[PDB]
């Protein structure tokens, strides 16, 4: 048995729909496909089950596009909410025993009508030797690349608190204790808008 979730991460704004792909391989004639979401606690939450001999599954906001010949069983989540940000797993179940995919991390983003991408230099903390750069107000589809220097740390884009109801914004941070570290070049490994603001 094999379950393939080729996408490691996907970003989509609130109120939109998102499709998470899953491909499987099985020699069995009768089986089930399950979709679970794994919460930050690492708890597994049931979303939907697709039977090998059934029509397209539906449960709450979840639906499955079951392409049996293609052994494709994509999950669509409709009307996305901030609480939907989690890691989603596709699993193939034969006699209770499950085979899982690698999982796909879905980040649900706020609707940013007026992106204002910018990189800000923060004041040094009198309690830390770390210099911090904040990349903020960029749009959902911005990809933040990892550092290519062991002495420079760069986070991915953050996940908004699911109960947030204000000052909603996408951001990443970069920090270092290197003498030469500057915010002007900290996020160079990323492809960013030509109008990103870099204040002096």
């Amino acid at each position: 048995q094999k379950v393939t979730q080729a996408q490691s991460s996907v970003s989509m704004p609130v109120r939109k729909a998102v499709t998470l792909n899953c491909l499987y391989e099985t020699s069995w004639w009768s089986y089930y496909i399950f979709w679970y979401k794994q919460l930050p606690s690492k708890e597994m939450i049931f979303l939907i089950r697709q039977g090998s001999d059934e029509q397209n599954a539906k449960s709450g906001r979840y639906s499955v596009n079951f392409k049996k010949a293609a052994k494709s069983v994509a999950l669509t989540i409709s009307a996305l909410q901030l609480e939907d940000s989690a890691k989603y797993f596709c699993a193939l179940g034969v006699t209770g025993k499950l085979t899982f995919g690698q999982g796909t991390i879905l980040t649900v983003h706020p609707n940013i009508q007026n992106p204002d991408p910018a990189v800000y230099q923060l004041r040094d903390s009198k309690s830390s030797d770390k210099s911090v750069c904040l990349f903020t107000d960029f749009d959902s589809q911005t990809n933040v690349s990892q550092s290519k220097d062991s002495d420079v740390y760069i986070t991915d884009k953050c996940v908004l608190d699911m109960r947030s109801m204000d000052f909603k914004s996408n951001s990443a941070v970069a920090w270092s204790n290197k003498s030469d570290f500057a915010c002007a070049n900290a996020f160079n490994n990323s492809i960013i808008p030509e109008d990103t603001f870099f204040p002096s």
């Binding site: 379950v3 399950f34 679970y36 606690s41 690492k42 708890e43 597994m44 049931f46 089950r49 797993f89 699993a91 209770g96 025993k97 499950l98 085979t99 899982f100 995919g101 690698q102 999982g103 991390i105 980040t107 204002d116 910018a118 800000y120 230099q121 923060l122 004041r123 040094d124 903390s125 309690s127 830390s128 770390k130 911090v132 904040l134 903020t136 107000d137 062991s150 740390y153 986070t155 991915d156 953050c158 996940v159 908004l160 608190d161 699911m162 109960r163 947030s164 109801m165 204000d166 000052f167 909603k168 914004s169 996408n170 951001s171 941070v173 920090w175 603001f197 204040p199 002096s200």
Partner: protein, 241 residues
């Protein structure tokens, strides 16, 4: 519901680590044991069965992992001669329902020595004046660094009340040295408020980082403070200038 015990455990290498899977309000003659290494899939290890021998999956050493069906409501998994390579997430399940009933899992951390356990260092960074001028908004940054194991919970507290608006946190902790097996971790979060709220010297901002560490019963010989389960915070007052 299926309940696992313990939820978390930090064990010394060479010890026997027992993990329990209990079916509450129902009986299970069969229980499944899964293992998940970080950023990897859940993999079936073994199947516990009432009145018969445990079934083991390919590559699972029967000598290293003892599976036992103790009763019609209990299945146990024993990590014999625990090694740091055994550090993983162990989750059990029992048949029943559309899916299966899953336990909440066990975060097993195996350390060569309890001195490999480090709490987070927590720092707060104040809003940039350039951000305030450009957007009339003010973002605080919290950094939690050098902790091991990678399990922390970060929250923001304004004037002694937890806040959720304007809060955005890293999906997962960052491996400080990705190429090192003994790497420590870091995590960041942001809190955005209006510049008017930030510029009030009466407002209090605190980033709280809960860390799961050593138990009260655990041995400690180092000069540094015993890294027990604790809260590490960083704070700042509003700034009128």
């Amino acid at each position: 519901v299926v309940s696992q015990h313990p939820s978390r455990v930090i064990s010394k290498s060479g010890t026997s680590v027992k993990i329990e899977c209990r079916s509450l309000d129902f009986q299970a003659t069969t229980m499944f044991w899964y293992r998940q290494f970080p950023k990897q899939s859940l993999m079936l290890m073994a199947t516990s069965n009432e009145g018969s021998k445990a079934t083991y999956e390919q590559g699972v050493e029967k000598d290293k992992f003892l599976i036992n069906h103790a009763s019609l409501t209990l299945s146990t998994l024993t990590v014999t001669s625990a090694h740091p390579e055994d550090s993983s997430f162990y989750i059990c399940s029992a048949p029943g329902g559309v899916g299966a009933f899953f336990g909440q899992g066990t975060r097993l951390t195996v350390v060569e020595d309890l001195k490999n356990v480090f709490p987070p260092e927590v720092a707060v960074f104040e809003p940039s004046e350039a951000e305030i001028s450009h957007t009339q908004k003010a973002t605080l940054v919290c950094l939690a660094t050098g902790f091991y194991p990678d399990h922390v919970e970060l929250s923001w507290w304004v004037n002694g009340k937890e806040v959720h608006s304007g809060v955005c946190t890293d999906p997962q902790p960052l491996k400080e040295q990705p190429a090192l097996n003994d790497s420590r971790y870091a995590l960041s979060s942001r809190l955005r408020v209006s510049a008017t709220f930030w510029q009030n010297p009466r407002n209090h901002f605190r980033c709280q980082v809960q860390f799961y560490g050593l138990s009260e019963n655990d041995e400690w010989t180092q000069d540094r403070a015993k890294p027990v389960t604790q809260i590490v915070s960083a704070e700042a007052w509003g700034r009128a200038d």
